[PDB]
Curated annotation (Swiss-Prot):
Annotated protein name in UniProt: Na(+)-translocating NADH-quinone reductase subunit F
Single GO MF annotation: electron transfer activity
Cofactor(s) required, per the database record: [2Fe-2S] cluster; FAD
Function in brief: NQR complex catalyzes the reduction of ubiquinone-1 to ubiquinol by two successive reactions, coupled with the transport of Na(+) ions from the cytoplasm to the periplasm. The first step is catalyzed by NqrF, which accepts electrons from NADH and reduces ubiquinone-1 to ubisemiquinone by a one-electron transfer pathway.
Chain ranges of the FAD-binding FR-type domain: 1-141
Any one biological process term the GO annotation gives: sodium ion transport
Enzyme Commission designation: 7.2.1.1
Length: 279
């Protein structure tokens, strides 16, 4: 296991509650990881204020609505946490992460904010970030079966890594689709990336479903929760959904609803691979 003291290239919001942390590896080297894998970030003792975070006005609505800038996080001893690569292995020299900020639950507002994610959200371009690894178990199976990727929230990271690894490094012709659920259009990201792959690869398609599209979205795409949209628009009519491989990563409510849906279809657990962030 190696450690790298990386430099933060950027740490921009991609969604209301998700930042994309981009890290430059020293000397241009790469972490020798597999898609679906993860690194660990370690943080020293520190103290951060949410009021100091850089959150663009476009994403600030819920932050103001719930007074999330009230929070502070004091960490007296080093801590360490896993985060999944959003880049694939031939995106060299960098580690890209998608980090959800783990705020106090709205029903429990005076408990401490999430320690490591509040630290990551405090990082700005030029800061140093120590990572170690790589690790992993959420690896793609080596078959020719159709793949169905299902993502929500920061689960975008290992899905992006997997899908790019299949199409760019493995040059796979397997049938592949990606279904991503989000609340409204501002919560979407990597749209240029996946639109690009879908235009260039006739074996790949992707869909987004919004559960609460906003008036400003002018949304005419799928609406609702992703397990309903995947079922209604693809799996219901599928001639053999039990023969696909399902790769899923999302928030806990999404994981549970998707897995329940798949099992009611008769998919067996061997064909359902969950990357559980432990929410
Ligand atoms: C293999 C792996 C890969 C992962 N990849 C990703 C990834 O790519 N992106 C990502 O976002 N996450 C990922 N995770 C999850 C991630 O490691 C952290 O668990 C996550 O960031 C939360 O950690 P934290 O330190 O911010 O929050 P913690 O300090 O662990 O707190 C978690 C939550 O509990 C609340 N809390 C604190 N004190 C109390 C109390 N007394 N009572 C009740 N509640 C309390 C906090 O407000 C917070 O919401 C991954 C996890 C694993 C295992
Ligand atoms: Mg966005
Ligand atoms: Na396509």
């Amino acid at each position: 296991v190696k450690k790298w003291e990386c430099t933060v290239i950027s740490n921009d919001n991609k969604a209301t509650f998700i930042k994309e942390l981009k890290l430059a590896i020293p000397d241009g080297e790469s972490v020798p990881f597999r898609a679906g894998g993860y690194i660990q970030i370690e943080a020293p003792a520190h103290h951060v204020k949410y009021a100091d975070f850089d959150v663009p006005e476009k994403y600030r609505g819920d932050w103001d609505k719930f007074n999330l800038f009230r929070y502070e996080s004091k960490v007296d001893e080093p801590i360490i946490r896993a985060y999944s690569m959003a880049n694939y292995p031939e995106e060299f020299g960098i580690i890209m992460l998608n980090v959800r900020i783990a705020t106090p639950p709205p029903n429990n507002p005076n408990v401490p904010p999430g320690q490591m994610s509040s630290y990551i959200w405090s990082l700005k371009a030029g800061d140093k970030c120590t990572i170690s690894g790589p690790f992993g178990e959420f690896f793609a199976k080596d078959t020719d079966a159709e793949m169905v990727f299902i993502g929500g929230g920061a689960g975008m990271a290992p899905m992006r890594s997997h899908i790019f690894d299949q199409l760019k490094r493995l040059k796979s012709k397997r049938k592949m689709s990606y279904w991503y659920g989000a609340r409204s259009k501002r919560e979407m990201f990597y749209v240029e990336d996946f639109d690009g792959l879908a235009a260039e690869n006739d074996n790949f398609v992707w869909h987004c479903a919004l559960s609460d599209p906003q008036p400003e979205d002018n949304w005419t795409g799928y609406t609702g929760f992703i397990h309903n949209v995947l079922y209604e628009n693809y799996l219901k009519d599928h001639e053999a959904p039990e023969d696909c491989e399902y790769y899923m990563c999302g928030p806990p409510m999404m994981n549970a609803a998707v897995i329940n849906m798949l099992k009611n279809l008769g998919v067996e657990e061997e064909n359902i691979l969950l990357d559980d962030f432990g929410g």
